[PDB]
Scaffold this motif. Structure first.
Motif, PDB file in Angstrom:
ATOM      1  N   UNK A 147       6.632   8.595   2.854  1.00 22.03           N
ATOM      2  CA  UNK A 147       6.747   7.239   2.330  1.00 22.03           C
ATOM      3  C   UNK A 147       7.881   6.503   3.020  1.00 22.03           C
ATOM      4  N   UNK A 148       9.118   6.956   2.817  1.00 21.96           N
ATOM      5  CA  UNK A 148      10.265   6.349   3.469  1.00 21.96           C
ATOM      6  C   UNK A 148       9.907   5.971   4.872  1.00 21.96           C
ATOM      7  N   UNK A 149       9.770   6.958   5.744  1.00 20.25           N
ATOM      8  CA  UNK A 149       9.498   6.679   7.151  1.00 20.25           C
ATOM      9  C   UNK A 149       8.287   5.819   7.395  1.00 20.25           C
ATOM     10  N   UNK A 207       0.830  -1.201   0.000  1.00 23.88           N
ATOM     11  CA  UNK A 207       0.000   0.000   0.000  1.00 23.88           C
ATOM     12  C   UNK A 207       0.856   1.238   0.000  1.00 23.88           C
ATOM     13  N   UNK A 208       2.120   1.072   0.354  1.00 20.11           N
ATOM     14  CA  UNK A 208       3.037   2.193   0.437  1.00 20.11           C
ATOM     15  C   UNK A 208       3.824   2.364  -0.839  1.00 20.11           C
ATOM     16  N   UNK A 209       4.428   1.292  -1.342  1.00 19.47           N
ATOM     17  CA  UNK A 209       5.202   1.443  -2.559  1.00 19.47           C
ATOM     18  C   UNK A 209       4.286   1.772  -3.679  1.00 19.47           C
ATOM     19  N   UNK A 210       3.143   1.099  -3.666  1.00 17.62           N
ATOM     20  CA  UNK A 210       2.126   1.410  -4.628  1.00 17.62           C
ATOM     21  C   UNK A 210       1.238   2.437  -3.960  1.00 17.62           C
ATOM     22  N   UNK A 211       1.288   3.674  -4.444  1.00 12.13           N
ATOM     23  CA  UNK A 211       0.497   4.740  -3.851  1.00 12.13           C
ATOM     24  C   UNK A 211      -0.968   4.358  -3.819  1.00 12.13           C
ATOM     25  N   UNK A 212      -1.502   4.121  -2.627  1.00  9.96           N
ATOM     26  CA  UNK A 212      -2.884   3.709  -2.564  1.00  9.96           C
ATOM     27  C   UNK A 212      -3.668   4.375  -1.473  1.00  9.96           C
ATOM     28  N   UNK A 229      -4.802   7.675  11.713  1.00  9.02           N
ATOM     29  CA  UNK A 229      -4.450   6.534  10.898  1.00  9.02           C
ATOM     30  C   UNK A 229      -3.588   6.817   9.670  1.00  9.02           C
ATOM     31  N   UNK A 230      -4.014   6.213   8.561  1.00  5.84           N
ATOM     32  CA  UNK A 230      -3.332   6.242   7.265  1.00  5.84           C
ATOM     33  C   UNK A 230      -3.578   7.489   6.430  1.00  5.84           C
ATOM     34  N   UNK A 231      -2.606   7.797   5.591  1.00  2.82           N
ATOM     35  CA  UNK A 231      -2.652   8.973   4.730  1.00  2.82           C
ATOM     36  C   UNK A 231      -2.466   8.602   3.239  1.00  2.82           C
ATOM     37  N   UNK A 232      -3.158   9.273   2.315  1.00  6.72           N
ATOM     38  CA  UNK A 232      -2.908   8.982   0.901  1.00  6.72           C
ATOM     39  C   UNK A 232      -1.777   9.879   0.363  1.00  6.72           C
ATOM     40  N   UNK A 233      -0.676   9.270  -0.088  1.00  7.91           N
ATOM     41  CA  UNK A 233       0.510   9.949  -0.629  1.00  7.91           C
ATOM     42  C   UNK A 233       0.163  11.055  -1.599  1.00  7.91           C
ATOM     43  N   UNK A 234      -0.760  10.778  -2.519  1.00  7.13           N
ATOM     44  CA  UNK A 234      -1.164  11.799  -3.485  1.00  7.13           C
ATOM     45  C   UNK A 234      -1.632  13.075  -2.761  1.00  7.13           C
ATOM     46  N   UNK A 235      -2.512  12.894  -1.776  1.00  2.52           N
ATOM     47  CA  UNK A 235      -3.028  13.998  -0.993  1.00  2.52           C
ATOM     48  C   UNK A 235      -1.909  14.709  -0.294  1.00  2.52           C
ATOM     49  N   UNK A 236      -1.060  13.962   0.398  1.00  2.36           N
ATOM     50  CA  UNK A 236       0.053  14.602   1.075  1.00  2.36           C
ATOM     51  C   UNK A 236       0.966  15.285   0.060  1.00  2.36           C
TER      52      UNK A 236
END
Ligand code: MG
Ligand code: MG
Ligand code: MG
Ligand code: MG
Ligand code: MG
Ligand code: MG
Ligand code: MG
Ligand code: MG
Ligand code: MG
Length: 113
Positions: A106-108, A19-24, A86-93
């Motif tokens: 992502x890294x962290x 879910x992390x490497x693949x932006x989801x 909780x979780x965050x969407x990379x695109x949004x961030x």
């Protein structure tokens, strides 16, 4: 990760690393703060609501019943800060705090696992 049932909030193990490497779009996402300002919350029965505002403007944020809020009526919230738990969407961030933010998130978030 997780399964649709009541309130299963995060994602552990490899599932997450996927879910992390693949932006989801995480199962239990967390509405980030597009605006860096101050906090305001409301009472009505059905849906809660957190409002971020600066001397410039305010933004309405819909936080349904399950969303446990991390923020309180009163202090500042930088752009892309967690306003839900909780979780965050990379695109949004990405859009909000920037690339450097997503990148650094992502890294962290990956090493967390
Ligand atoms: Mg439940
Ligand atoms: Mg959980
Ligand atoms: Mg677990
Ligand atoms: Mg002033
Ligand atoms: Mg909305
Ligand atoms: Mg507090
Ligand atoms: Mg304080
Ligand atoms: Mg910048
Ligand atoms: Mg950090």
């Amino acid at each position: 990760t997780g399964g649709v049932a009541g309130a299963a909030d995060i994602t552990q193990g490899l599932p997450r690393v996927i879910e992390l490497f693949e932006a989801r779009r995480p199962k239990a996402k967390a509405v980030i703060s597009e605006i860096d300002g101050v906090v305001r919350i409301e009472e009505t029965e059905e849906k809660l609501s957190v409002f971020v505002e600066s001397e410039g403007f305010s933004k309405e944020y819909k936080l349904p019943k399950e969303a446990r809020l991390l923020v309180k009526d009163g202090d500042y919230v930088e752009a892309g800060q967690p306003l839900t738990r909780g979780a965050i969407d990379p695109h949004q961030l990405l859009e909000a705090k920037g690339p450097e933010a997503v990148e650094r998130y992502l890294v962290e978030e990956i090493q967390k696992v």
